[PDB]
RNA sequence: AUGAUGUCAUACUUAUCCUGUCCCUUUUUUUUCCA
């Protein structure tokens, strides 16, 4: 619908129409806008082709069913890490178990 | 005066010209030989009806084409307005529906054709820019889940008319020039000096006695603009009484009183009628523009000014150039127009700066982020710098995300694709800012409304031609006071502007030179030397210049022309020299075209010339499609050199039927291609006069390379073990990276350019035989030197 | 194109080799070619036709 | 069988062709009717002067077109159509407006042409897609 | 079929028959001629490449040579009258048309090598 | 064709994503991919030559991937022909899908 | 019984190199019988 209206009222679809639904959808709507849409409008049969790679490479793919450039990126587990820390106790409870205090590093934000 | 010696010569010029053309047609009627029962007759009368019928088929459908077009061409400007009656009304219904019926009863047949070749056909063994909308319905198909007012116009025109800086200055300026034949009229842009003035003249009747009023411009597109504008004012059709004549496009009629043109166009009108006796007035606009054609017209028209006092000299320009203007022109009075719409706050940096391109970047950054609404204009030097700029700007856009607003970076220069030129002309999408990165192409003749900020890093890339080396180098150059003032003046045209100079008041007021060197000094003049010796003024020294070239420059010109064979050993005109001089193209090229006569490679040498006319923009080389681009280029790469490369490229384009999508597929600038085609076609229209027989080399590129030599023998280098070095001066050159021979690196080299960019360079190069050099120029090239 | 048909069909008929045993493929298909997706799905189209019939 | 099938394909093809051909011509005859009655329905205070303007304009147009083709073989094809394709020209000529486009804060927020799944590799650390803090 | 399987010659001949039929029906479509393609009189030559100074009298002179003329009609640019540099010329006999043709093709008169072909006019 | 060949070669490098100790033969295949990435027209010339004249190919090696419950054959083809087939793969699938060869019930399809 | 001719790869020499290299600003030039 918004694409029709952008043609009819002839506007440009602005960031405000698509920041709400920006990783939603299945392909994903943020694949419309990637860098290489131009040469990926030419990759057809990619799904069969990743199925059949199993007779060509000696290793076994666990994401044979999908493609990140084509299907989008369909899971986001960035909060797993945050809640894992809060459940183990927080960075302080977590580094009472380690050799951190024997390094004499003054604080743990820099650790690298 | 020398004016009278001139017109003496020039009337005899027209006499001998007409008699020459008449002689030649007689020659051709000589060369050309054209000399011219019962059942025989009743046999071929069926065959004469055969041809009558078929030529009549094409002829009848052709006449249908004529009246077909004419119905709508007629209903364009009569019907949709006026209270018109039964007869032509009914016949509009008629011609409407009837050309529909023609298109329809032919679209039927074509439908048959395409539908019946849609089908399946067992194979037989015998030994437009939408790749991003064909990938945007891949996604919407993968993601589907279904189970009077013309008088009012005139009022508005006059109402705006009245508010010019010249409308209240109307009368006294009229009376003033009624006094003085030569009146210098200083006024800045937007005053209307180009538009309102010739109107005033016409309504005051200087066109009476059938006379004309010339307006010259240095730029075609600007002339077309001006002409559209004043024809709209005058309430007539552009082309009949107000007209513009530019190369390849006449827009005049014998109703034309107000005729607009170029400076070379007016010189060429002196190639038609030395007196301009049908013109009462010549108004020369913006003469400050400093072209060779401006600096020739100045002399010629000053002669005419002394010789024709009933004739009128008007020379208007932008800047303080009135001092030398009047002084050369016997100190004509100077009528001052005050014209400057809105103010500019012009700022200087605190200091001098080290990294001025980056400084550009961070400037526009701050401006955009903090400022109120308003569009921005930024200058750079040119292409590579400018895309690097948009690189940086859009990268910081990437990083700063929704923290900022939409920054329409648009580059603009001369060679970039014309769709990409136009893209800047759209009205800005509400709420976003538009920043145009530009070159000094945006000094002049391009009108971008909305620009409220202007940034000058205070530079330019000027050509500099030293003749002692034959070298013209397009190098960096701090830009003049006139430049900075006018680059700034580009602003303000609708509102208060700002002009950020990347340099201080100190450097500005103190080390700023007023004007770019009037062109004739700095440029190479081969064709204008050719021109004034085509007009025959034997003393080329005491001629009435505005600024003479260095005697050095002229000496080089003379040696150039003599060696090439346009000059005798005393410096006058051969038939070679004249025949080449009629060509509006360089003598080297001209010698090559004449060489096609000897080598029977007419067509191929023609198309080559057509290419070198415009080359500088042939192949689009985008960063975002570098490899496919290099590829659609590397396709044509022929053995022999860039010139025959161009030959095949044009050949294949026209082969495709002058297809635009052809060049779009094959990474070629359609602009370059089609203007080059036009220059070749008008070259062919010259070709009868220059007496060239239309011949093919029959695939023998040896003739091609040899005619190339017979033209460009001067433009040659040889292998040295310390690099590629000249044939004559043994100064050291290098090959352009993008040469079709760049890795081939031939022993005996011909070029077409001689520049010294970051290192000495040469362009449009080819591999030659040193033997053709003793074939062609044993008087200039001796054997021992090869 | 009969050229491409012949390339594909002659490329399925190769010598297949393991440590020291060699034989020549003549009957089936090497599924480790890169167009073998295409060949399998085209053949499967023909057998969809034998199962459904042309009308359905 | 391949020869036989080639023949039957071609014969069926030209049969169906000829059928649709004849039908097209019948369509065309109805359009012949359309044209005759078109001019018939046609034939029966600005128009009289706009009408002298009709023949004035059209006839001097034929003058210029004939004279074009006569000075140069098709100087009509060398003037009038070639007037109207080049861009600076059109912009100076004030011709107006001679698809969806949208904001550029949208584009190029991701660059690459390969799936990030590394082609079946596993041992590399690509779980989350944002450095921790 | 058999409007195709006869030759290649008469094949394209039938297609040229067509091209005629379609161009006729087309020209009547856009509406010039009242009656459809009535055969043109064998007794007028259309003579182009002409001079605006050769008139009905002089052309009827030189084409009085081969046959009895019925007229000489240089069509006029109406409101200025300037000769259209072509003409129609009207004979009494087929033989008169032919005899004028076969000597007057591409001849130089008034320094112009005019062209004569028969009239294609249904006008 | 350069879009189709760029897709081919991206697909082929995905095998050696990690850039391990691979071997002689994988080093040589990576060399071929890079040189045909640099000069994309020597490549396409070579390809269309193969496709036009060749009908006797080298020999392929076999081995098995053990999935503990059954085995899978894995075929090893020579890198030159691997490149010509990668290209032919992409080309046939692009054209077949544009001409609509495969009707919609043939289903490892790219849409879901 | 040692000729030059070479599009021959290999061997070899100079405490001979691994640090001596790269993409154009602006723009203009008169024209001719149609058939």
Curated annotation (Swiss-Prot), chain A:
The modification N6,N6-dimethyllysine is found at residue 35. It is found in: Nucleus; Nucleus speckle. It comes from the Eukaryota. The modification N6-acetyllysine is found at residue 73. Widely expressed. The MPN (JAB/Mov34) domain mediates interaction with TSSC4 and SNRNP200. Has structural similarity with deubiquitinating enzymes, but lacks the residues that would bind the catalytic metal ion. It is linked to Retinitis pigmentosa 13: A retinal dystrophy belonging to the group of pigmentary retinopathies. Retinitis pigmentosa is characterized by retinal pigment deposits visible on fundus examination and primary loss of rod photoreceptor cells followed by secondary loss of cone photoreceptors. Patients typically have night vision blindness and loss of midperipheral visual field. As their condition progresses, they lose their far peripheral visual field and eventually central vision as well. This is Pre-mRNA-processing-splicing factor 8. It comes from Homo sapiens (Human).
UniProtKB/Swiss-Prot annotation, chain B:
Residues 174-338 form the Helicase ATP-binding domain. The keyword Protease does not apply. The modification Phosphothreonine is found at residue 477. It comes from the Eukaryota. Changing residue 439 to M: In NMOAS; uncertain significance. Residues 5-36 have a biased composition (Basic and acidic residues). Its EC number is 3.6.4.13. ATP binds at residues 187-194. Required for pre-mRNA splicing as a component of the spliceosome. Contributes to pre-mRNA splicing after spliceosome formation and prior to the first transesterification reaction. As a component of the minor spliceosome, involved in the splicing of U12-type introns in pre-mRNAs. Also plays a role in innate antiviral response by acting as a pattern recognition receptor sensing splicing signals in viral RNA. Belongs to the DEAD box helicase family. DEAH subfamily. DDX16/PRP8 sub-subfamily. It is linked to Neuromuscular oculoauditory syndrome: An autosomal dominant neuromuscular disorder characterized by variable features including myopathy, neuropathy, hypotonia, joint contractures, growth delay, chorioretinal lacunae, sensorineuronal deafness, agenesis of the corpus callosum, and seizures. This is Pre-mRNA-splicing factor ATP-dependent RNA helicase DHX16. It comes from Homo sapiens (Human). The lineage of its organism: Eukaryota, Metazoa, Chordata, Craniata, Vertebrata. The gene is DHX16. The chain holds residues 162 to 1021 of 1041 of the full protein.
Swiss-Prot record, chain E:
The gene is PPIL4. Transmembrane segments: none annotated. Signal peptide: none annotated. Residues 43-121 form the RRM domain. The chain holds residues 198 to 320 of 492 of the full protein. Abundantly expressed in kidney but has a ubiquitously low expression pattern in other adult tissues. Belongs to the cyclophilin-type PPIase family. PPIL4 subfamily. This is Peptidyl-prolyl cis-trans isomerase-like 4. It comes from Homo sapiens. PPIases accelerate the folding of proteins. It catalyzes the cis-trans isomerization of proline imidic peptide bonds in oligopeptides. There is a cross-link at residues 4, 15, 21 (Glycyl lysine isopeptide (Lys-Gly) (interchain with G-Cter in SUMO2)). It is found in: Nucleus.
From Swiss-Prot, chain F:
It is linked to Retinitis pigmentosa 13: A retinal dystrophy belonging to the group of pigmentary retinopathies. Retinitis pigmentosa is characterized by retinal pigment deposits visible on fundus examination and primary loss of rod photoreceptor cells followed by secondary loss of cone photoreceptors. Patients typically have night vision blindness and loss of midperipheral visual field. As their condition progresses, they lose their far peripheral visual field and eventually central vision as well. Plays a role in pre-mRNA splicing as core component of precatalytic, catalytic and postcatalytic spliceosomal complexes, both of the predominant U2-type spliceosome and the minor U12-type spliceosome. Functions as a scaffold that mediates the ordered assembly of spliceosomal proteins and snRNAs. Required for the assembly of the U4/U6-U5 tri-snRNP complex, a building block of the spliceosome. Functions as a scaffold that positions spliceosomal U2, U5 and U6 snRNAs at splice sites on pre-mRNA substrates, so that splicing can occur. Interacts with both the 5' and the 3' splice site. This is Pre-mRNA-processing-splicing factor 8. It comes from Homo sapiens (Human). It is found in: Nucleus; Nucleus speckle. Widely expressed. The modification Phosphoserine is found at residue 25.
């Amino acid at each position: 619908l918004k694409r029709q209206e952008a043609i009819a009222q002839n506007r440009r679809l602005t960031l405000e129409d698509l920041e709400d639904s920006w990783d939603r959808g299945i392909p994903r709507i943020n694949t419309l806008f990637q860098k290489d849409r131009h040469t990926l409008a030419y990759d057809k049969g990619w799904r069969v082709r990743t199925d059949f790679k199993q007779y060509q490479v000696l290793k076994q793919n666990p994401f044979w069913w999908t493609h990140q450039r084509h299907d989008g990126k369909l899971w986001n587990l960035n909060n797993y890490r945050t809640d894992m820390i809060q459940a183990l106790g927080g960075v302080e409870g977590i580094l009472e178990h380690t050799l951190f205090k024997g390094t004499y590093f003054p604080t743990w934000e820099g650790l690298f | 005066d020398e004016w009278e010696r001139t017109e003496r010569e020039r009337l005899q010029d027209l006499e001998e010209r007409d008699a020459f053309a008449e002689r030649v047609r007689q020659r051709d009627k000589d060369r050309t030989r054209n000399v011219l029962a019962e059942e025989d007759r009743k046999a071929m009368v069926p065959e004469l009806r055969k041809k009558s019928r078929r030529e009549y088929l094409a002829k009848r459908e052709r006449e249908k084409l004529e009246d077909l077009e004419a119905e709508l061409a007629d209903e364009e400007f009569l019907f949709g307005d006026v209270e018109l009656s039964r007869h032509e009304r009914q016949e509009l219904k008629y011609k409407r529906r009837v050309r529909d019926l023609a298109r329809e009863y032919r679209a039927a047949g074509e439908q048959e054709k395409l539908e019946a070749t849609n089908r399946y056909h067992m194979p037989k063994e015998t030994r437009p820019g939408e790749e991003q909308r064909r990938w945007e319905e891949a996604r919407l198909g993968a993601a589907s889940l279904k189970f009077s007012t013309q008088a009012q116009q005139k009022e508005s025109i006059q109402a705006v008319r009245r508010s010019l800086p010249v409308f209240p200055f109307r009368e006294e300026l009229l009376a003033a020039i009624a006094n003085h034949q030569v009146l210098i009229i200083e006024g800045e842009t937007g005053s209307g000096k180009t538009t309102q003035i010739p109107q005033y003249l016409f309504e005051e009747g200087y066109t009476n006695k059938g006379m004309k009023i010339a307006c010259t411009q240095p730029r075609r597109v600007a002339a077309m603009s001006v002409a559209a504008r004043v024809a709209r004012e005058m309430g007539v059709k552009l082309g009949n009484e107000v007209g513009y004549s530019i190369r390849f496009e006449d827009c005049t009629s014998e109703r034309t009183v107000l005729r607009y043109m170029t400076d070379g166009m007016l010189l060429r009108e002196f190639l038609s009628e030395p007196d301009l006796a049908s013109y009462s007035v010549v108004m020369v606009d913006e003469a400050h523009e400093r072209t060779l054609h401006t600096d020739i017209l100045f002399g010629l028209i000053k002669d005419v000014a002394r010789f024709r006092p009933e004739l009128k000299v008007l020379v208007a320009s932008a800047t303080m150039d009135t001092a030398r203007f009047s002084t050369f022109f016997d100190d004509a009075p100077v009528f001052r127009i005050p014209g400057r719409r809105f103010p500019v706050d012009i700022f200087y940096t605190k200091a001098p700066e080290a990294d001025y391109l980056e400084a550009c970047v961070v400037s526009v950054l701050q401006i955009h982020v903090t400022q109120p609404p308003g569009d921005i204009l930024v200058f750079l030097t040119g292409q590579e710098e400018i895309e690097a700029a948009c690189e940086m700007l859009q990268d910081r856009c990437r990083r700063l995300g929704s923290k900022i607003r939409e920054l329409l970076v648009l580059p603009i220069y001369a060679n970039l694709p014309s769709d990409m030129q136009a893209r800047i002309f759209q009205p800005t999408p509400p709420g976003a800012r538009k920043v145009v990165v530009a070159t000094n192409i945006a000094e002049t003749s391009l009108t971008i409304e909305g620009i409220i900020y202007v940034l000058d890093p205070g530079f330019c890339k000027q050509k500099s031609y030293n003749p002692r080396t034959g070298m013209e180098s397009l190098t960096v150059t701090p830009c003049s006071k006139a430049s900075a003032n006018q680059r700034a003046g580009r602003a303000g045209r609708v509102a208060a502007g700002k002009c950020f100079r990347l340099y201080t008041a100190w450097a500005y007021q103190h080390e700023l030179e007023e004007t770019t060197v009037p062109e004739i000094q700095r440029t190479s003049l081969g064709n204008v030397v050719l021109l004034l010796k085509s007009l025959g003024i034997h003393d080329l020294m005491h001629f009435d210049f505005l600024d003479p070239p260095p005697y050095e420059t002229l000496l080089l010109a003379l040696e150039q022309l003599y060696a090439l064979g346009a000059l005798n050993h005393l410096g006058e005109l051969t038939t070679s020299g004249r025949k080449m001089a009629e060509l509006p193209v360089d003598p080297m090229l001209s010698k090559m075209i004449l060489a096609s006569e000897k080598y029977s490679c007419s067509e191929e040498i023609l198309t080559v010339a057509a290419m070198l006319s415009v080359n500088n923009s042939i192949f689009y080389r985008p960063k975002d499609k570098v490899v496919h681009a290099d590829n659609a280029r590397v396709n044509f790469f022929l053995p022999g050199g860039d010139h025959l490369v161009l030959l095949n490229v044009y050949t294949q384009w026209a082969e495709s039927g002058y297809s635009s999508q052809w060049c779009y597929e094959n990474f070629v600038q359609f602009r370059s291609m089609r203007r080059a085609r036009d220059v070749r076609e008008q070259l062919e229209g010259l070709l009868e006069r220059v007496e060239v027989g239309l011949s093919s080399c029959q695939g023998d590129y040896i003739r091609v390379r040899k005619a190339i030599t017979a033209g460009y023998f001067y433009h040659t280098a040889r292998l040295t073990r310390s690099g590629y070095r000249t044939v004559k001066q043994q100064q050291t050159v290098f090959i352009h990276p993008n040469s079709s021979l760049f890795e081939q690196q031939p022993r005996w080299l011909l070029y077409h350019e001689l520049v010294l960019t970051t290192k000495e360079f040469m362009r449009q190069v080819l591999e030659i035989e040193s033997s053709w050099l003793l074939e062609v120029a044993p008087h200039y090239y001796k054997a021992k030197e090869l | 194109d009969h050229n491409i048909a012949d390339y594909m069909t002659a490329k399925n008929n190769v010598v297949i080799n393991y440590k020291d045993m060699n034989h020549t493929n003549s009957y089936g298909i090497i599924r480790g070619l890169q167009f073998a997706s295409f060949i399998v799905q085209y053949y499967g189209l023909v057998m969809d036709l034998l199962v459904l019939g042309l009308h359905r | 069988a391949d020869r036989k099938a080639r023949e039957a394909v071609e014969m069926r093809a030209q049969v169906e062709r000829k059928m649709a051909q004849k039908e097209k011509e019948k369509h065309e005859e109805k359009l012949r009717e359309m044209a005759q009655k078109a001019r018939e329905r046609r034939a029966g205070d600005g128009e009289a002067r706009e009408r002298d303007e009709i023949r004035h304009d059209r006839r001097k147009e034929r003058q210029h077109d004939r004279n074009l083709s006569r000075a140069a073989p098709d100087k009509r094809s060398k003037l009038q159509r070639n007037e109207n394709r080049d861009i600076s020209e059109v912009i100076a000529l004030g011709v107006p407006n001679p698809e969806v486009q949208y904001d550029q804060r949208l584009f190029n927020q991701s660059k690459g042409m390969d799936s990030g799944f590394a082609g079946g590799e596993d041992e590399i650390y690509n779980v989350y897609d944002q450095a921790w803090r | 079929d058999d409007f195709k399987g006869r030759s290649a010659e008469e094949v394209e001949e039938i297609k040229a028959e067509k091209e005629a039929k379609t161009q006729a029906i087309l020209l009547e479509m856009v509406g010039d001629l009242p009656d459809a393609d009535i055969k043109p009189p064998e007794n007028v030559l259309f003579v182009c490449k002409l001079n605006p100074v050769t008139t009905d009298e002089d052309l009827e002179i030189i084409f009085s040579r081969f046959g009895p003329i019925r007229s000489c009609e240089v069509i006029r640019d109406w409101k200025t009258g300037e000769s259209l540099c072509y003409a129609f010329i009207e004979f009494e006999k087929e033989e008169d048309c032919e005899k004028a043709f076969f000597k007057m093709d591409n001849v130089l008169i008034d320094d112009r090598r005019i062209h004569v072909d028969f009239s294609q006019s249904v006008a | 064709d350069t879009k189709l060949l760029i897709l081919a070669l991206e697909r082929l490098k995905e095998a050696y994503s990690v850039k391990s100790r691979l071997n002689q033969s994988q080093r040589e295949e990576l060399g071929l991919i890079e040189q045909a990435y640099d000069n994309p027209h020597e490549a396409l010339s070579r390809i269309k030559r193969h496709l036009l004249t060749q009908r006797a190919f080298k020999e392929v090696g076999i081995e098995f991937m053990d999935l503990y419950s059954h085995l899978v054959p894995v075929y090893d083809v020579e890198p030159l022909e691997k490149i010509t087939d990668a290209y032919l793969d992409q080309y046939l699938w692009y054209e077949a899908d544009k001409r609509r060869l495969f009707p919609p019930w043939i289903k490892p399809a790219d849409t879901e």
